Ligand binder design. Structure first.
Ligand SMILES: [Cl-]
Length: 278
C-alpha cells in the first residue's frame, strides 16, 4: 500500500539521473522561508525494500518534518530489482549519483554542499551508509568531479554487513561469498559498510530494534563498536524489543517514529547541521 510512483504532495520533482531509459527522481521539500542564496543543510532519504521494491513515499513524513525545521529535505528514487532488474551495486551507484547531484546543484537548491545528510531504512539505510563510507564503484556519466560522499548519515535499521570475511564463521564458506558476488553485482566487501570502517569518517546515528529478525542487532553493535574504536561519532540507539521497520510512520502509535525524529534532530543540532529549536 505504498505507491510507486508516489504522489508526494507538495514536493518539487527533479530528475537526478537518467539511466537504462528511466528518469530517477528526487522529491524535494523546501522550508516555507526558502530563498535561492540560502545555505541550508540537506537530507536525502533512501527507501527500504530489500533492493527489490519500495517507494520514496516511505520517507515523506520525515521530509515534511525536516523541511519544517529549515532543511531542504528529499526522498530519492533508485533502481530496484523488481522494476529495473538491477543488482545491489547498481542501487549503490544511484544513491551516490543522488548525493553528487545535490552537491552539484547545491547553489540552486539553497543548500550548503558540505551539510548533506544521507539517510534511509534497511536496504536504503545500507545505501546511505555506502554514500558515507564505501568507495565509488563506477564513474558516473554525470557530474564526474563532484564528491558523492555524504557529510553525515541517519540510519534506520540499516544493513551494514554484506560479507562474512573477517567474522567468526567457523568454516570457510567461500561458496557463500561467490553466491553473494553474483547477487550483489560485485565483490561483497565492496558494498559492505562494515568492511570499510576507518578513522576520519563522517558522523552518524543509527536506530535499530533489539528484536530485529531481518537484520540482527548484533551486526549493528559490532559495527558501532568498531566505528567508535576508529574514533568516529557513531551513535547507536537501541529500541528494546522492537522489530524491523519499528521506526516507520504508522507503526506502534507513531511512538518510535516520533522518538527517532527527536533523536535524529538532536543529532543534527549536535553536529552543527541544524539550529537548536527556537
Ligand atoms: Cl523483525
Amino acid at each position: 500500500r505504498l505507491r510507486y510512483p508516489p504522489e508526494m504532495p507538495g514536493a518539487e520533482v527533479k530528475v537526478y539521473k537518467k539511466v537504462d531509459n528511466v528518469d530517477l527522481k528526487l522529491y524535494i521539500y523546501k522550508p516555507a522561508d526558502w530563498k535561492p542564496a540560502d545555505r541550508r543543510s540537506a537530507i536525502v532519504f533512501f527507501f527500504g525494500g530489500g533492493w527489490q521494491s519500495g517507494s520514496p513515499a516511505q520517507f515523506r513524513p520525515q521530509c515534511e518534518y525536516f523541511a519544517g525545521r529549515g532543511m531542504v529535505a528529499m526522498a530519492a528514487d533508485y533502481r530496484v530489482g523488481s522494476r529495473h532488474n538491477v543488482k545491489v551495486a547498481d542501487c549503490v551507484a544511484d544513491a551516490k549519483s543522488a548525493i553528487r547531484w545535490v552537491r552539484q546543484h547545491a547553489a540552486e537548491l539553497g543548500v550548503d554542499p558540505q551539510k548533506i545528510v544521507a539517510s534511509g531504512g534497511s536496504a536504503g539505510g545500507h545505501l546511505a551508509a555506502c554514500t558515507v563510507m564505501v568507495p565509488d564503484l563506477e564513474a558516473p556519466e554525470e557530474d564526474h568531479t563532484i564528491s558523492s560522499q555524504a557529510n553525515a548519515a541517519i540510519l534506520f535499521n540499516p544493513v551494514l554487513i554484506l560479507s562474512r570475511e573477517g567474522l567468526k564463521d567457523h568454516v570457510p564458506r567461500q561458496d557463500w561469498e561467490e553466491r553473494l558476488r553474483e547477487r550483489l553485482g560485485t565483490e561483497p566487501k565492496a558494498v559492505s559498510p562494515y568492511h570499510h570502517i576507518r578513522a576520519g569518517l563522517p558522523p552518524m546515528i543509527i536506530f535499530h530494534g533489539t528484536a530485529d529478525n531481518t537484520v540482527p542487532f548484533e551486526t549493528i553493535r559490532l559495527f558501532a563498536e568498531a566505528m567508535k574504536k576508529a574514533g568516529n561519532r557513531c551513535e547507536l540507539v537501541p529500541f528494546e524489543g522492537a522489530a524491523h521497520g519499528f521506526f516507520n510512520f504508522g507503526r506502534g502509535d507513531n511512538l518510535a517514529y516520533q522518538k527517532t525524529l527527536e533523536l535524529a534532530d538532536e543529532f543534527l543540532v549536535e553536529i552543527g547541521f541544524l539550529a537548536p529549536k527556537g
